[PDB]
Design a protein around this ligand. Structure first.
Ligand SMILES: CCCCCCCC/C=C\CCCCCCCC(=O)O[C@H](COC(=O)CCCCCCCCCCCCCCC)COP(=O)(O)OCCN
Ligand SMILES: CCCCCCCC/C=C\CCCCCCCC(=O)O[C@H](COC(=O)CCCCCCCCCCCCCCC)COP(=O)(O)OCCN
Ligand SMILES: CCCCCCCC/C=C\CCCCCCCC(=O)O
Ligand SMILES: CCCCCCCCCCCCCCCC(=O)O
Lengths: 244, 635, 334, 334, 244
């Protein structure tokens, strides 16, 4: 799906100019679980900006299903990201006044579509994620893990193709993070969807299948996993990150 | 989905959280309606005073609307900032910027206009109460009746509609501006700014100590000193919060060792970092509170003088200038069945030198020390003292003088006559006045000389500074009895208001300072409510940023009954510092000029500070009720 | 007691005080109102309000006081009859919960009784092939095979009869009956019943009955004879069983003694307990040991007492102490 | 609930209004206090009292509405958190009642478990003498009486083993297992068990199993097979059984065809009912009749379809449809 | 110290009951280092929760240091779990507005040990775990491994009886994990204190004295180690796990 080539992010505020991204060629195909990882001060937020189109792009040649974002306008970009892209944020954002069910059904309640299909979709998502029993509760009377799972499931109801994700462990302990990561990995297999994260937690990066390392841009030395035991891979990731 | 029902839920949720805002809105509308109704009441003209009358409420309203508008604008620019996590979400779902504005301008207009409608309804039943309160401080009788005064509704509606228009303009200016889907150790300067601020405040207070002392005495040298004092005080107050709190907190922290309990760790965590950000608001709060308290205290101190100075300015109950008018008024009193103990005394004006009796500095000149014009009286007329030749006794206290004209003990007192000068010594100082202030210039005392020396002084009769009338024509009164009829007889005798009466100078000053205190008190109450609400509206954010901390501590065995105990001290430390600084400011500002109004302090200041402290600590008590709610839902 | 009432009603005393203060203030700040009369009225109202508060507390705080003690009180009707809807609400809720609990318990007991009923029924339809097997076993000719099959029949028959009597020993209370019983003929038929076991094991018997009449239930006395005799036979081999019946004092005693291997002295008093079985030999693991305990339990309604005198390597003496005839005078009267 | 609140606190409001009325009366009757300066006080006090009552209603009438909302249906914790001292005792009483109910339920469940254990021990001590009687009975030499005792051995076996299926189906849901099964050894074992009885009835076995492997569980399908075979036989007399298995498409089907009396059409739908017994023949009384319903209730999770083709006077054809092998991949893989 | 007598626990949502304890009763004496492990869906974590005061016991009886704590109110139970039952969690659970020394001394502010005794005890604890060089550094400056040692030092300062450790060595490298486990073993050797630990790593469990393999709420044997070689016990537990 995604072939990110020549990652260029321009700068030059006042007089100082920085090449935080110095041109990177990136290859993913259908159904991967790639996550790029660096260190502090490597511009992970700028990685979101260049990748997730949160802000206006500067340069580069990157296409989504062959659709380049650099030959296409701002409002068209908003429509493209709203009808073709999804996001998951570091801190969950759920309206307190609404209910758990209403929060997930909100994105589909703006296109004037039939009610029965929406009910069936919510049924399927809730059953497959495990929050079905909480159909009439409020976000003020449930724990953090359930809230984060609901936030993650909110982005899996508008018929998505690619769902971005910043670090989904900032406001979670180990148990909730492990449950969420296992559920997301299972969702990757049941319905085919590519998930890209950039996190600072090696534990959260051990779940992946292709990890990319950066220091200032083009540096690679990526790993492959393939048939690892899921723990030696974690040790190797930690050792490589410490050395580099 | 269900836009209207979502808006209704949001409106109810907003109404549940922000109720002090509604209370403040209704209270402000009530006071504005009350003052505007009071201004146009035809009975307001019964307030006889040196001031215009109903032209002061026109100042009270215009100075109140500014505070109300400032409070409302700041509250509405605080409210919208806490709703970005929803604006971003609505922007990413697909709703444009022309629908979010209608979403968030329908959960506010109903609340605002409902509060406005309630305020007008409840301002009708307090106008009579306000009028009755006013016609008890000025001591006048009236027939205050209830009426609607349709003129006030237009003013209130126009003013608040304009304020709401400004609010909407400001809100629209923010939504489509900050968007684009965007969801420690001390330093050397920080170790000097606190000391600089503390020393600036201390030296400002020290300079404020002297003022009208023995130094700086010039008609123009006081203004520069006062401006310097105000500037230094304001700058020191600003620098206090931005650097000095950090220094003291750092010392207290690195003085306990490492054994910090729950209360200290909950207290020091907030006010070492959060107080630094808010350094432009606490200064305003402290200065305005100090100003209000000081002005109120003086306005109550001058009420005690409104009685003593009226008793003392005229020695008797009446004073008379013209012999014919006095004799005809006595003729009228003759059939009035009034037994008047009349006493009269010729008055002479002579100049003397008292430069050798002042223990201060020649800067305390107040005229030529060798040519002070004083009032000299005979010894036979005075029925209390029998002085001899070569001895003079001063009369009167005049609290101003003891702090201004310092007088030595018996030295040498020279009399500046035409061709002679006798040495005299200071025996003592009297307290009562035997001469009205008209004959003795501004506040100069009167001297007593021997009758024998009087027979030469009156024979000499230096014709240079003598007054037009050399007499103290004044009618006294019998034992305490009815006096009002004699009062209107006195007014109908004198249509040229050139005689002075004891019971008439006691009314204009009382009315003037009563109006001053009325205005100042109501304005101070309004500012108290405003500051309380504003300071309460930041603890919500400060507590919802400390919610994770509670959750972590709760996994280590701590119970809610201890977290609440720690919060009960954190809130006290948050709400105490501005009040204490304001109290110190007020006490160090009042004491500089307490001896310019009345002769009694420590009476009003204690009452004012106690009332302010209670009405300000109500809001401090009204915050643990939200902290407990935050703690309970942090499992 | 008073403290809770005060700390709950603190929201109305404040309103009363605020009303008094507002009235006093407005009366004070008026030129046409007598302050002293209003003060007098305030004092009188305060006194009357204090008296009214005393009466209100005394009358009000009773229902919650009773239900507070009710929570661990032995009785259940300690709750006073409600006079206020806010208490009738709690009364209705509590009554509903209690009746639900009672209905649930009754339903559970009824279901258990039914399932026991089907169990015993199925026991009966298994009993019918048992008498079919008895007929077919009675129809052979070979001595050894017939003896072995009859012994196995008798063992399984006594086991399942013991189990069925264990099912009905739960409500043996419903079929109590006392009548005169002759011992010798009943013992003769009972001995004839156990013919196969004694033929296989070659166990002799001795009969010495000085007393002939006792007072018990015929079926239950026969079952006691079955329990004691089968226990003695399964715990003895090739020994003469000496049975003696005599009147000791006012009570009739049936002393039966065997000459088997006996019981270890450490385990002598534990025979009457549940599940007591021999562990010396591996062949005794399958034994139940239930008959003795159930016999002891249902011995009380028949007023029959059991005494044991056991010796290791000599034998065991079992005494069946029948109660006094004059002791049945009280039982018949009641 | 406004009426309930107004009725409940029908004394404080009356006291306040009586005080206001007394003030108005003393102001009106005495020509010493202006009557225009007391109505304002009454008005202000009434306004404040109305506002206070409106603000107090909501904070007071919550607990006694939540209690009725919960009632006795479910969600025992739906009651609001007690705040005032009075409601704490009510909450404590409710919690105590709930705890007592929980204790009673736990005791009932424990007693049921103990009685189940006792009956299962009885089952064990019936099943071991089953082996004993098997090894003893399989030693005799006659022919006709041999067939007799043989089919009653299998008759007892049937009801007593069905009791094991009953006690197992009490918890059947936790014993699923899917793997390939060969039906021919099962059929041969069933024939060997029923060899004497089928020989006595003169029933030949026409076994031609075209299909070789099936995908299901062994034990309960074996039980279903014996139960269906026994039913088909007892609807028959001296007739040959045709056992036919064919791979009908992707599913295996056992078509068992006989020449029995069959089932009358008016009573065909009622054969599968609980407790059904055929009244045409008196020999069918020995059949328990619980096997068919137990097989139906056990085969519902097994996804088994049974097709019946019963003709009166011609025979009965029972066709059971094995679930497709691919259908159990969702059970094996997932 | 810890004797268990048929502890019951059924996980239910008032409509569906899921039992997770199937005949567990453990006999634990003083001064032994044990380990509980087995499977992934097993109730070993639930077992550790129910043994402590975190979760309520359905049916059974427990005895901690002679005390019977099952049928007693919440207040005294909280007092018990405060003055006994130290804890080491999966995550660090450290405060950022404090230092390390204050973090490992805050839970001691309930008894008021004055200052000299507290300083001496802190010095004794710190000089054994090698953190005395980091007395006044904020937690955001130290490595990830040292934070676990800081948490352990905090947990080992008031001298509790039973130490319910829960997978400490989960997010570390080889060297720091080995050093931390060696320090824990040495401190157990010196100070008599029972430590109950759950882990999934064989090398982590090698340092223990006994290992309990709970499988679907059952005993299923237990090892005893003894005076054997560490490596031999390591391969023994490897082949035992391979048998499963
Ligand atoms: C000079 C003339 C002075 C007149 C002053 C009159 C002002 C008082 C009047 C009306 C108050 C209107 C604003 C407050 C009402 C909003 C609060 C409210 O209703 O919240 C509802 C419940 O009430 C509350 O929780 C808040 C309780 C506050 C009681 C009223 C407090 C207002 C005045 C107290 C302020 C005291 C400050 C005094 C400082 C001088 C909704 O909450 P909920 O959780 O959804 O529960 C629903 C129940 N089923
Ligand atoms: C920032 C500090 C806030 C403190 C509270 C400010 C409240 C604003 C209101 C009124 C300002 C009053 C100034 C202080 C009162 C001066 C005391 C004084 O002058 O002494 C005497 C007291 O008389 C008065 O001044 C009237 C005092 C009434 C003020 C009541 C205080 C609370 C005011 C709140 C009223 C508004 C609330 C309306 C709704 C409840 C005057 O002489 P007299 O004893 O009445 O005898 C007359 C003939 N025998
Ligand atoms: C500054 C003026 C103060 C007096 C305002 C007079 C208006 C009072 C209006 C009604 C108050 C109702 C609020 C009481 C809430 C319940 C009391 C409580 O819970 O403690
Ligand atoms: C006489 C002036 C002072 C009056 C002080 C009492 C005013 C009411 C104080 C409590 C109001 C809020 C009560 C409920 C708050 C909540 O539950 O959030």
């Amino acid at each position: 799906i995604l072939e990110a080539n020549k990652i260029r992010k321009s700068y030059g505020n006042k007089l100082n100019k920085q090449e935080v991204l110095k041109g990177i060629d990136i290859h993913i195909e259908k159904g991967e679980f790639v996550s790029i990882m660096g260190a502090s001060g490597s511009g992970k937020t700028t990685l979101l900006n260049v990748l997730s189109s949160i802000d206006q792009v500067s340069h580069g040649t990157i296409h989504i299903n062959g659709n380049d974002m650099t030959a296409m306008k701002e409002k068209q970009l908003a429509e493209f990201r709203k009808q073709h892209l999804g996001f998951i944020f570091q801190d969950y954002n759920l309206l307190d006044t609404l209910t758990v069910k209403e929060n997930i059904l909100l994105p589909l309640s703006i296109t004037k579509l039939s009610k029965k299909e929406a009910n069936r979709k919510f049924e399927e998502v809730a059953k497959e994620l495990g929050i079905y029993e909480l159909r009439d509760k409020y976000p003020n009377e449930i724990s953090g893990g359930q809230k984060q799972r609901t936030s993650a499931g909110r982005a899996f109801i508008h018929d998505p193709s690619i769902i971005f994700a910043d670090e989904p462990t900032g406001a979670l302990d180990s148990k909730s993070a492990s449950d969420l990561l296992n559920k997301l990995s299972q969702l990757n297999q049941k319905r085919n969807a590519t998930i890209i994260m950039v996190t600072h937690d090696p534990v959260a990066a051990s779940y992946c299948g292709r990890v990319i390392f950066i220091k200032d841009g083009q540096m690679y030395t990526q790993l492959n996993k393939g048939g690892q035991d899921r723990q030696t891979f974690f040790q190797d990731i930690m050792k490589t990150q410490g050395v580099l | 989905m269900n836009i209207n029902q979502l808006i209704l839920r949001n409106l109810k949720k907003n109404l549940r959280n922000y109720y002090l805002y509604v209370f403040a809105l209704i209270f402000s509308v009530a006071l504005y309606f009350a003052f505007v109704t009071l201004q146009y009441d035809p009975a307001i003209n019964e307030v006889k005073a040196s001031i215009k009358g109903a032209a002061a409420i026109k100042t009270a309203s215009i100075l109140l609307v500014a505070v109300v508008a400032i409070f409302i604008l700041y509250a509405n620019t605080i409210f919208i900032k806490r709703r970005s996590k929803e604006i971003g979400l609505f922007q990413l779902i697909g709703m444009t910027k022309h629908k979010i504005f209608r979403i968030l301008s329908a959960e506010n207009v109903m609340l605002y206009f409902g509060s406005l409608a309630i305020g007008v309804a409840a301002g009708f039943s307090i106008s009579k109460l306000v009028l009755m309160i006013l016609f008890k401080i000025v001591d006048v009788k009236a027939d205050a009746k209830l009426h609607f005064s349709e003129q006030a509704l237009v003013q209130t509606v126009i003013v608040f509609c304009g304020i709401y228009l400004l609010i909407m303009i400001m809100n629209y200016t923010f939504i489509k501006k900050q968007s684009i889907l965007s969801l420690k150790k001390i330093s050397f300067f920080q170790m000097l700014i606190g000391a600089l601020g503390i020393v600036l405040i201390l030296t400002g207070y020290y300079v404020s100590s002297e003022l009208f002392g023995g130094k700086f005495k010039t008609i123009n040298e006081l203004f520069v000193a006062m401006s310097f004092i105000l500037g230094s005080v304001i700058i020191g107050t600003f620098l206090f919060y931005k650097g000095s709190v950090t220094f003291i907190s750092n010392i207290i922290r690195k003085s306990k060792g490492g054994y910090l309990n729950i209360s200290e760790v909950l207290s020091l965590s907030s006010i070492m970092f959060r107080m630094k950000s808010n350094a432009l608001l606490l200064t305003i709060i402290t200065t305005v509170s100090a100003l209000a308290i000081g002005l109120l205290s003086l306005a109550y101190i001058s009420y005690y003088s409104s009685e003593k100075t009226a008793e003392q300015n005229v020695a008797a109950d009446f004073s008379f200038m013209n012999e014919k008018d006095a004799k005809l008024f006595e003729n009228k009193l003759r059939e009035s069945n009034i037994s008047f103990v009349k006493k009269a005394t010729p008055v002479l004006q002579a100049n003397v030198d008292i430069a050798n009796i002042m223990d201060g500095t020649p800067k305390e000149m107040q005229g030529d020390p060798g040519n002070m014009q004083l009032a000299v009286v005979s010894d036979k007329d005075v029925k209390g003292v029998d002085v001899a030749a070569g001895e003079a006794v001063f009369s009167g206290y005049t609290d101003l003088l003891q702090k201004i004209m310092v007088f030595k003990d018996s030295g040498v007192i020279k009399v500046k006559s035409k061709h002679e000068t006798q040495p005299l010594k200071y025996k003592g100082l009297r307290e009562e006045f035997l001469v009205s202030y008209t004959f003795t210039s501004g506040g100069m005392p009167a001297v007593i000389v021997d009758d024998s020396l009087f027979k030469q002084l009156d024979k000499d009769k230096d014709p240079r500074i003598q007054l037009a009338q050399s007499t103290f024509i004044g009618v006294n009164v019998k034992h305490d009895d009815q006096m009002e009829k004699a009062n209107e007889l006195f007014q109908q005798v004198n249509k040229k208001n050139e005689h002075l009466s004891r019971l008439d100078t006691s009314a204009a000053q009382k009315s003037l300072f009563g109006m001053v205190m009325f205005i100042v008190g109501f304005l101070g109450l309004t500012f108290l409510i405003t500051s309380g609400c504003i300071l309460y509206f930041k603890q919500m954010g400060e507590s919802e940023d400390e919610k994770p901390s509670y959750t972590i501590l709760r996994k280590l065995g701590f119970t809610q009954g201890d977290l609440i105990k720690g919060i009960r001290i954190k809130q006290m430390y948050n709400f105490g510092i501005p009040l204490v600084v304001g109290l110190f400011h007020s006490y160090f500002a009042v004491q500089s000029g307490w001896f310019l109004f009345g002769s009694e302090v420590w009476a009003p200041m204690i009452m004012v500070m106690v009332l302010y402290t209670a009405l300000y600590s109500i809001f401090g008590f009204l915050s643990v009720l939200y902290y407990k709610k935050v703690i309970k839902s942090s499992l | 007691m008073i403290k809770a009432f005060l700390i709950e009603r603190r929201s109305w005393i404040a309103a009363f005080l605020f009303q008094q203060a507002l009235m006093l203030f407005i009366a004070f700040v008026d030129p046409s109102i007598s302050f002293g009369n209003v003060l007098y009225m305030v004092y009188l109202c305060i006194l009357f309000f204090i008296i009214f508060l005393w009466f209100r507390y005394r009358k009000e705080t009773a229902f919650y006081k009773s239900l507070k003690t009710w929570e661990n009180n032995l009785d259940v009707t300690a709750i006073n009859e409600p006079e206020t809807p806010f208490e009738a609400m709690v009364e209705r809720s509590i009554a509903g919960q209690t009746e639900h609990l009672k209905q649930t318990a009754a339903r559970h007991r009824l279901a258990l009784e039914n399932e026991k009923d089907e169990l015993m029924a199925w026991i009966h339809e298994v009993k019918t092939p048992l008498t079919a097997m008895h007929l077919i076993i009675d129809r052979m000719e070979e001595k050894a095979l017939k003896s072995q099959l009859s012994y196995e029949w008798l063992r399984i028959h006594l086991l399942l009869d013991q189990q069925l009597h264990q099912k009905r020993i739960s409500f043996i209370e419903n079929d109590l009956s006392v009548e005169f019983i002759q011992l010798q003929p009943l013992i003769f038929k009972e001995i004839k019943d156990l013919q196969s076991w004694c033929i296989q094991k070659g166990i002799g018997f001795d009969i010495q009955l000085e007393a002939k009449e006792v007072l018990s239930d015929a079926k239950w006395l026969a079952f006691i004879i079955r329990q004691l005799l089968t226990n003695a036979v399964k715990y003895s081999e090739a020994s003469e069983i000496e049975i003696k019946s005599f009147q000791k004092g006012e009570q009739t005693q049936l002393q039966v003694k065997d000459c088997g291997r006996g019981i270890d002295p450490k385990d002598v008093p534990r025979i009457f307990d549940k599940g007591f079985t021999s562990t010396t030999d591996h062949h005794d693991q399958a034994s139940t040991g239930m008959g003795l305990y159930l016999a002891k339990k249902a011995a009380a309604p028949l007023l029959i007492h059991i005494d044991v005198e056991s010796e290791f390597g000599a034998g065991t003496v079992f005494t069946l102490t029948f109660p006094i005839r004059n002791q049945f005078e009280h039982v018949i009267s009641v």
